[PDB]
Subunit: 355 residues, 3 copies
């Protein structure tokens, strides 16, 4: 399956005792069907209590979502330190190339972050970390410069420098203004709610950073035994990450003479990532065991809307009656009208195992 | 020839007794010389009298031009039906991913549409139709979902659903607000007219949709035995479609040590498509049999102008006299000035067979 | 080395006795590590005294910098000739597809121009000249059209035309409004100056043309025995051209399991071009023989800033003291604070051979 990435697909970028940094591979190298979002990367960050991450920068724009825990982030912006507290449900952006670090000063809860990267390198989809604080593990960018250059740059003998750039081996994650603020997404829950679930969205019109990358961030909850009404985005491509719970998906894909839609089926568990290309109708079904929590990013979100194939607000009811009659061509009269009004909910519906 | 596509190059996407949908292949797969417009696709639609097209959507932005007939289009926009009458010469846009249908309620005239698509899929140049009304021919996207999902989605037993999503086999085309309005292009004819022809243009400053895709649409008529003055676009790439009549083209292409311009020659007949890359000078010559009618789309139209190589307004007359003298280097004095003023027309001239 | 281009890499596009046109190859064909700037091309122009360049146009946007000499440029804009004097240090832009020519009317000094091109063709990175004045050397675009077309276009017999389009063999360069004005960059020198060097920048907010291509142009001078403080751009990619003098560079590149930064070393001499991808820290060291003069273009310049790794304004001093302490992990207390304040200069420092 080119569209569904289970947690075992994540490659480790940094592994220590105090934390982990995982990243899904370049989308463009997995399939040709995903080449149009090859510029975007998905990463996860886990930081144990009482930890700090090494100051570094990446050659990529960075949208983060805090899935669990609390702490703070600090990045460098024009000889000033921008410091912001992070909390569960926070969405925040770090400009590309800006030296940053994260701190988890909680005594019992891990800090967990899910992120979308947008590369700004000369290679599409490729990003690299540049550590500016460090030691042997990992090495810093200072390790690439000759001794004469470094001695001249810092105006100190190399021995004092080697003593400074070689005393850290505890890894990337280790045990101890007027710039934008984090926006708590998982807070608000205004956007849609019925008896079966809810979701919340933050877009370009809510935050200057999301606007600069044309991304909408969403967080949804499906109650046990419920399903999203089959629906599609008009122009946005979605990257979804399962936060909690379990379930499955069904997606229709005409790419996988006559017109034919293939069935994309997959299981959903914690850490599962799936990609919904623009126009592809999908339904997410939640298990009866527990609720389904899903975070998602909409790429190319400007002007995007969602059209529903079933439910109280489906597109079929919006078509003229005659056309609907002709297109399905039924002798029975308005049997179609009876069927179209059987579903009393919209957007989020009762599932198969709870009809 | 990588630049000229005769009507036999069009592949059939849908063929029935009441209508046809044809599409030229991906430009990027024909030649490397066209990779920069690989995102754009050319389609044609013919609908017999008293016909309706199945409601569906495509993962692409859609600029249509009505070449012949009248009828109407309807697309779905936020639980509202946007319905607009279409007439010969109308230009209209349908947003990507929006469910639409076309109707030809005329009793004697076919509805014929020529279109430029701009893909919004994850694959550049590839677009697919998603039928939401239908049956076995064609199948709908509903056919990809399991029975339990569908039964739950619609809240009806599958037997009533199969009876609804299986009674249509007559094909894609069959016998029976405050949103934008179609703009009639073939109407106005203000833009240029002399004794030999005329043309009309609609661009980003005339219509919000054309502005969002940066396209100018043009319609031109060449009288029998006339030619366009050899000329080039500064930055726009043109995709031209022959509406009526016959003729030929000559184009200079340096791609096909020393500087050398190859001669791109081709015959023009009804349904011929040709591509003029930016900077490539071209002349269109009309046969003596009849007039030449041409529709065209300018890609990357913002800031684009046309420079003429011959005729009353050519670039050579704008150069300083001395430079013009030096560059051609002639002993005869101002023989160049005599030659440059021999042509009394501009833009559209008398052809070879009527000098 | 994929990042460093010595003068022998330039291919000759036009060679005569009165001048030369050189161009570096497509960046995208040299390495995959440069694919993201494959749309940009670097060219050099030398014109002897009392020379004129043949009127032509290219399918590319053109930013020029005059490295040496004086003269003027003229391009065609809507039946008007835009004529502008050029002087050493001038930056000017020519819109793509606009017929232009250059003149060197100086009696003793050559006119030398260094340029960044941004292609507007259907092939990324490829540009071609279209000569409209000419002869056998080079041929014009008129040479691609048939005799009947040309005779009809100009309304003159072909013999008079062949006598006009065949009398020039002296090559591309030969011996004799309210539109934008050239902006002298090498003039101002406000932007930064200390005891070791200076630099000057012109960006999108200073000039409408630079804004349309999102490029900043810079000119810097390093005194003998000095170095730039190791630093990186946040998001811009730089293309640098050595104007005068000699020296070397050291660049850290993580592309060339564990995190590892490779050392990119190269020699700098006149005509050396080097590319600094976004995020890559670099230092330029000037020889003790003479000063180092460098011209550079910043691609994707909007929102870009520079962060310094050493010197009075380095990023390490901006980090919180504790984090800096933890990250380098030193028993010695604030030995880091002593080392960080040893360098009293910023941006441009004393080199290795003059500590
Ligand atoms: Cu698909
Ligand atoms: Cu060509
Ligand atoms: Cu690198």
């Amino acid at each position: 399956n080119p569209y569904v990435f289970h947690s075992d697909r994540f490659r480790i970028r940094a592994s220590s005792e105090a934390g982990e940094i995982r990243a899904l591979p370049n989308f463009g190298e997995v399939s040709e069907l995903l080449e149009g979002i090859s510029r975007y990367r998905v990463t996860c960050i886990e930081m144990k209590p009482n930890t700090v991450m090494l100051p570094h920068y990446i050659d990529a724009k960075w949208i983060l979502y805090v899935t669990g825990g609390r702490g703070y982030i600090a990045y460098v912006q024009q000889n000033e330190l921008v410091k912001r507290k992070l909390e569960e449900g926070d969405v925040f952006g770090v400009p590309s190339g800006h030296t940053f670090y994260l701190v988890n000063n909680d005594d019992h809860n891990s800090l967990r972050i899910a992120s979308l990267l947008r590369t700004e390198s000369t290679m599409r989809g490729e990003y690299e970390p540049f550590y500016v604080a460090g030691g042997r593990n990992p090495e810093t960018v200072y390790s690439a410069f000759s001794d004469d250059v470094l001695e001249a740059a810092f105006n100190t003998d190399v021995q004092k420098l080697e003593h400074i750039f070689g005393a850290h081996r505890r890894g990337v994650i280790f045990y101890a203004s007027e710039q934008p603020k984090p926006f708590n997404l998982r807070n608000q829950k205004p956007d849609f709610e019925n008896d079966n679930g809810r979701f919340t969205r933050a877009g370009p019109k809510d935050n200057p950073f999301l606007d600069s990358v044309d991304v909408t961030v969403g967080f949804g909850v499906l109650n046990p035994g419920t399903m999203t009404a089959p629906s599609h985005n008009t122009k946005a491509t979605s990257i979804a990450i399962v936060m909690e719970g379990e379930g499955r998906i069904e997606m229709a894909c005409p790419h996988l003479q006559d017109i034919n839609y293939e069935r994309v089926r997959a299981r959903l568990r914690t850490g599962t990532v799936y990609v919904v290309p623009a126009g592809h109708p999908i339904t997410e079904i939640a298990s009866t065991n527990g609720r389904l929590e899903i975070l998602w990013f909409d790429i190319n979100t400007s002007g995007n809307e969602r059209e529903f194939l079933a439910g109280k607000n489906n597109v079929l009811q919006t078509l003229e009656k005659e056309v609907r009659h002709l297109s399905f061509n039924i002798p029975r009269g308005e049997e179609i009208e009876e069927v179209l009004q059987a579903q009393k909910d919209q957007v989020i519906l009762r599932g198969p195992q709870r009809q």
